[PDB]
Design a protein around this ligand. Structure first.
Ligand SMILES: [Mg+2]
Ligand SMILES: [Mg+2]
Ligand SMILES: [Mg+2]
Lengths: 519, 519, 517
């Protein structure tokens, strides 16, 4: 009748709010999952890359940590790609895996996970296997503490399967931690003074802003400062309304490009974005002479690696509210030149159509409060042109740039919306290559009847001389989708796209719309 | 006109025989894959877990190392589960990933893979990123050297994308290494003396024997010794003919079970198997009093972790041939009690049928020289009963116990058979849960028109109190298979199974046969 | 025309990293070549001493310091000191030479393969640049990582051919946050919880002194009016031990601390671990009815706490702000000042008790001296006779590992001299501890540092082997390394030799025969 480690750990998890587990069960996790409490929810994915990316989307949508459970070394390993994405997104995930029993692990038995704590390195804030069964509950509290303290991120706990049935020491202590630190006030005041002195400042608001819930504070600061506001290149979140008069669009993604974009300004203020998220290499100066840079981030790693600038560490939400109070109202600052999207319509059109046609049709039917998930690199321009983000927490893309994230993340986001009482649709625009990586995640969408519309752009190739492995012939994506239980159609025209979109928006459960598009 | 690192590295790869690359291409790998030589082959998989497991099967079937190419941290991470399997199988894989350019990596740009060498740890023999572009070719030679020296295993090389276009130092030196070491002759002679002295010896021949090409040598030794011959529990390879009069079947998979199985013997000789591959925990003595143990393995890690016994390190093929010469012909050794399979027939039967029905139908139609790939844990007894392995290199299962291996490994094995000029069919029996993990691999089978028959046992659940996540409703596996380009049928009876099997064996290209079976 | 070497030293000068501690070897030659005239190289005879000396120098100056070590071998020799620097949150930039990129692929002699793994898990960051041209930016990055809170050591491995390559241009000079502030809203909740307490108790730990928050701590403590404990096993002391609210160090066991807090309804832990336990004696971490708040600059220390609600933030900022936030408590009947049981063993002949030794010390110790302590067995005597009354005036090993105090004392004195603080360092070191890093006293002699090493000689560190230290003439060893020395025969002679040592130029080693205990 004594409480076991299992009893008191689930009791702690409930108090912490960790009542949803994403995973794929195996033998080494049976003692953990056995007698799963009735008020907890287990979300099954067919493959671990999907489980962890789903948890990532869930955690991001709920603004709360999520628990993942993986099958020893094999399952942990399958999730390592999604782990990089979660780590780059600063998502508070508690990743657990079963481990062989302490009674046999010394002989390295079948499905042992030797040196388990090394495996997820270097992509976790913390990796741990308790020295004894009795500390499993405190280890969970600690995992939550590490994950949730800034900057947030995933952690790993390996638990020998025999631990769970051991007598507990007693109830687990329930702790709470700082999820924010504030900027040093004296340094923040120094930054404000430098900002007041600028003649031609520019403001960059990156993904940390939306993740801090600081959308409104960013707007209030941006409007007082009166400067043009850029977003991050290659954003995994969007943190400032893209229809705002001050919006100047995403930064370029190269050194030379950013150099040229900032050369008009005497000061760049970067809040919640890296300095800078560069992708392809085009040589230049990180910062052109005559342009100074300030950086504000909650992640000391991001200020540490910055090639240039003066930085400070602090929650970006606190920083923005405070900066608003500290800066002067500029004297007659000249309104930035409005951002103009080169829109032209390719509607109507028959399949195969341009990606430009596809995104315009989407913008005509997309509900105003829908969330957009993006995983189609060849079509970023189309998303920018036709689907501006105008609400907080309504745009998501891979934290790392690795694909196979958006499909399971969409399932996680919709599960998250349902848990937090938000009624909206998730629209995911995914390339056909990207769609294949974690295609099995759509089964979970169908199983939970999630309002997700997956719009798959089928052009028969990957989004990239004589390079092998780019072509994707011989895929009937509708059959696969139907096979996994999703509603589906292959669209023949912009009219059919529009009509199927309207039907999908009203359906119970997810739909996969396959849209043939041009290469 | 000067040779680049790219020129001379592919020249070296060709000389080494590394002319097939398994992977999934990305931006950070473009400079590697560009101008891919015409006589090389690129095998595309839709997801990295599949790419690496496919390479694993290819390498095992060809008896030669294979090259894998993965997309920076994201792609490396997606493959980590299959990496554990390859590492546990001692498969010589050279795993490479692209890395961000040396011109920008210091600022941790998008898709950088910081501390890349730590990531695949602890599941590689060696992990390396060259200190300069010019050493890339020597680093490949070294990767091959480490992978190929005993015990074989996978290695990891991370290559900054800018390296490939740098001027080479000159042609790369071509080296060759030992792929075997021999047992210390004086210690092996000591072991032979101990064997001569046994009154009731037993012999265990594990997966290293088949991987060493030592099938015949194992038979010759086993026949001279006259002892019963067990196989490994949970075998990833089978190394001794299962229809042999001396065959006593696989060992049990628990401590108590093995204890009881070996207690009749005064000496257990374990060649090329772990001591012992235990799975579930049932307490006992590793070795009962009165029973001694000798262990011979090419992997010092396996002798190091053994709880009991005297061991020696050496190639198992060399050891077996030599032991044959060293041991006495036993005087009138009593023939072991024959192994009797509890066969009873459930043919004919309508769907859903017993797994016993399914495997008997398979045994009636399976070509004698077919390879079997196994990934259906709830049906190991059926495989044992109806599909004995009677040829070398004709049985394969996951190295680690992690599922999602057999489907892509089957594709790799068939590609391997085609490369090495062996004409045979691969029959893969896969559970429905297992089939989902790396389901996209079947697209590669269809793209290369491989003679693979995937027999999927659909019982609606995973092969395992109150445990969540075991049920798999709402999957139409035929639609998915057809969607990926494979021939397919859903069988309704043993008659239909037999007929579809015969049709599949004659088809060009793979077939997925979905067989409804009982829970 | 400018090389990587040129622009890196230029950047280091601008960062203030102008003193280098180490012992140079072949693989460092290219780094140290043409060492600029305005930089200072402090040589130690062994690497453990070099890093611990850099630790003390950085703690004393309140600035980062650079350490340069000889490839795998030299880095390895310093790993024990690295643990101490890492536990103390000292911002040290540790560099080591590496074999040339031209050869390292063949694993040549003195190569350091997988260099970045070696100092793990005891650095915040470990790195070997992907190319020569990134070396200057790597140094800026190392500074950034070490200096951002919580501070700590980092490791850079530099292939020896990198230094002579052409630089890309001047290195960008960046500045970073060295503090974050508490979340104001969370701090305000903590303040409310403090106001609601009937009988709170305050713990002030080593972070407070490292943040220069001695005054803020006094101000807050005096307004709250609660008893004030210090950390067990302190590496710094942050609150005057002659203050009327001072209750002494916490016990060092679970059962002990459980008992110590049981009178209080709320424990407020600022800049101390929760809690620094050493021997195991079982209990509950907190008794029922006692709650705990924890404020630390190190997220690791809040993460591992077994109990409590915590927040992360600079402890100086938190203290100053808490003072403004809490109520003025009413009806103050103040806790009575701590009464130490003091009974003299003076005068006395050697071998004397440590009780005698410390009282003699208290009689002659300059009021503004720094104490460096490494004698676990005599902590009670230090508490009894040598209370810490000024900020930044007590130092002991960050980790618990011995061999730290001697080199640290050398670095502290060099740091005082660098920052223009005129004071004496008094180090009280057991005779076993004095041996680990005894070569460090050579650097003290070489730089003529005002350090008085008081070595408590009792011939030991049961039944456990390896505890006996016979056949050591420490006085002759010290003189051999160039230090003034004396073996004292009585309290009178101890006192006399102390006065001479405090007046002498350069360090003195006083060997004091003490009774075992
Ligand atoms: Mg495409
Ligand atoms: Mg099944
Ligand atoms: Mg002593």
């Amino acid at each position: 009748d004594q409480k076991t480690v299992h009893d008191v750990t689930y009791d702690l998890l409930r108090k912490l709010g960790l009542t949803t587990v994403f995973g794929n069960p195996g033998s080494t996790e049976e003692s953990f999952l056995r007698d799963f409490p009735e008020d907890f929810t287990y979300v099954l994915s067919l493959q671990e890359a999907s489980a962890l990316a789903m948890a990532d989307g869930f955690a991001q949508a709920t603004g709360k940590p999520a628990l993942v459970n993986l099958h020893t070394a094999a399952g942990t390993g399958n999730a390592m790609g999604s782990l990089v994405a979660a780590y780059r997104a600063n998502t508070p995930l508690i990743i657990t895996a079963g481990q062989q029993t302490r009674e046999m692990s010394v002989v390295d038995p079948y499905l042992n996970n030797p040196d388990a704590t090394t495996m997820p390195k270097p992509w976790v804030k913390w990796s741990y296997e308790p020295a004894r069964a009795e500390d499993v509950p405190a280890a969970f509290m600690q995992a939550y503490a590490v994950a949730m303290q800034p900057p947030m991120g995933p952690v790993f706990l390996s638990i020998p399967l025999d631990d769970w049935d051991k007598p507990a020491l007693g109830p687990a202590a329930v702790r709470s931690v700082s999820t924010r630190v504030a900027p040093d006030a004296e340094r923040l005041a120094q930054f404000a003074e430098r900002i007041n002195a600028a003649k031609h400042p520019m403001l960059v608001l990156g993904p940390e802003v939306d993740r801090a819930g600081a959308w409104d504070a960013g707007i209030e600061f941006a409007e007082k400062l009166g400067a043009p506001v850029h977003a991050s290149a290659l954003p995994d979140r969007m943190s400032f309304p893209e229809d705002h008069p001050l919006y100047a669009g995403p930064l370029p993604m190269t050194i030379a490009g950013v150099e040229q974009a900032v050369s008009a300004y005497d000061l760049v203020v970067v809040v919640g974005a890296e300095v800078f998220r560069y992708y392809p290499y085009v040589p230049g100066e990180y910062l052109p002479e005559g342009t100074d840079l300030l950086q504000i981030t909650a992640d000391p790693h991001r200020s540490a690696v910055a090639p240039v600038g003066d930085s400070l560490v602090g929650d970006v939400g606190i920083a923005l509210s405070r900066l608003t109070e500290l800066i002067d109202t500029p004297d007659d600052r000249v309104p930035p030149k409005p951002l103009v999207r080169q829109r032209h319509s390719d509607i109507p059109s028959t399949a195969p159509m341009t990606s430009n046609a596809v995104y315009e049709v989407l913008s005509n039917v997309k509900p105003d409060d829908a969330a957009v998930v993006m995983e189609s690199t060849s079509t970023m321009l189309d998303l920018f042109t036709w689907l501006p983000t105008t609400h907080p927490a309504s745009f998501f893309a891979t934290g790392s740039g690795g694909i196979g994230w958006g499909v399971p993340a969409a399932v996680g986001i919709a599960l998250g919306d349902r848990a937090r009482g938000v009624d909206r649709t998730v629209v995911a625009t995914i390339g056909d290559g990207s769609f294949q990586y974690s295609i099995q995640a759509i089964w979970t969408a169908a199983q939970h009847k999630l309002p997700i519309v997956f719009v798959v752009l089928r052009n028969g190739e990957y989004a990239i001389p004589n390079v092998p492995g780019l072509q994707l012939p011989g895929l009937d994506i509708s059959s696969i989708a139907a096979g996994f239980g999703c509603r589906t159609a292959t669209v023949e025209s912009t009219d059919m796209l529009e009509a199927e979109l309207k039907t999908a928006l009203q359906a119970d459960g997810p739909t996969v719309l396959v849209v043939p598009t041009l290469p």
